[PDB]
Amino acid sequence: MNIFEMLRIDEGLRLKIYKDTEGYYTIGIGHLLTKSPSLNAAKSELDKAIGRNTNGVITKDEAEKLFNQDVDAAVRGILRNAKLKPVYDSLDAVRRAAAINMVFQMGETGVAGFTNSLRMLQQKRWDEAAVNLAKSRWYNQTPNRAKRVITTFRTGTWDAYKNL
Ligand SMILES: [Cl-]
């Protein structure tokens, strides 16, 4: 298991434009295109992302290319953020994956707002951090995925992803 396999499990893979859990146009492995309700606007973003005039449809190779870029962007966002970087630096590689997962799903700004959870993670108060993380719109809206990510933070193991 690793961050790529982890996010592949959590996001799935779809080669045609679809709507994510919030109703936003998305493609591939959870690549958000736009928050606009316009499918045309989504298609425009897709073509710009891929570098060709698509039919709202991409190849697996293209989906994986975007995915790698998005994983990179998440790590980049963490390392450039004053609130996220020290917590990330403080973590083991398994828990680092959980942090990347959250940033991939909700963005750097959203994750940086988990101030109290972040503090508990940096203190390595795993059970307390887990309890705090679950007190969120995030957990309520995507509880099964959030449970997996929280279990990863709680245990520093891949146990939540091993049956998957
Ligand atoms: Cl599930």
Query: Which CA distances in Å does 146 have to 68, 101, 149, 159?
Result: 22, 10, 5, 14
- Structure tokens given for 28: 């591939």
Q: What is the Cα Rg of the chain in Å? A: 16
Residue ranges per structural domain of the chain: 1-164
H or E element at residue 17? strand 14-19
- 144 Cα–ligand 1 center, Å: 5
Region of 135 on the Ramachandran plot (φ > 0 left; ψ -120 to 50 alpha; else beta): beta
Residue 49 near residue 31 (C-beta atoms within 8 A): yes
Q: Is 132 annotated as a binding residue?
A: yes
Torsion sign, CA atoms 103, 128, 22, 64: positive
CB 6 within 8 A of CB 97: yes
What DSSP character marks residue 14? E
Local structure of 156: helix, strand or coil: coil
Residues 73, 59: Cα–Cα separation, whole Å: 21
Pair 26, 19: CB distance under 8 Å = yes
Residue 164's contacts (CB-CB under 8 Å, 6 or more residues apart) are 9
Tokens coding 146? 């959030």
Q: How remote is the CA of residue 117 from the centroid of ligand 1, in Å?
A: 23
CA of 47 to the centre of ligand 1 (A): 31
- Please give the distance, rounded to the nearest whole angstrom, from the Cα atom of residue 1 to the centre of ligand 1: 17
Give the determination technique.
Answer: X-ray
Strand partners for 26: 18, 32
DSSP 8-state assignment for residue 18: E
Give the Cα-Cα-Cα angle 55, 58, 62 (nearest 5 degrees). Answer: 145
Annotated binding-site residue? 46: no
Segment holding 19, helix H or strand E: strand 14-19
Q: Return the CATH class of domain 1-164.
A: mainly alpha
Catalytic residue set: 11, 20
Backbone φ and ψ of 18, nearest 5°: -140, 170
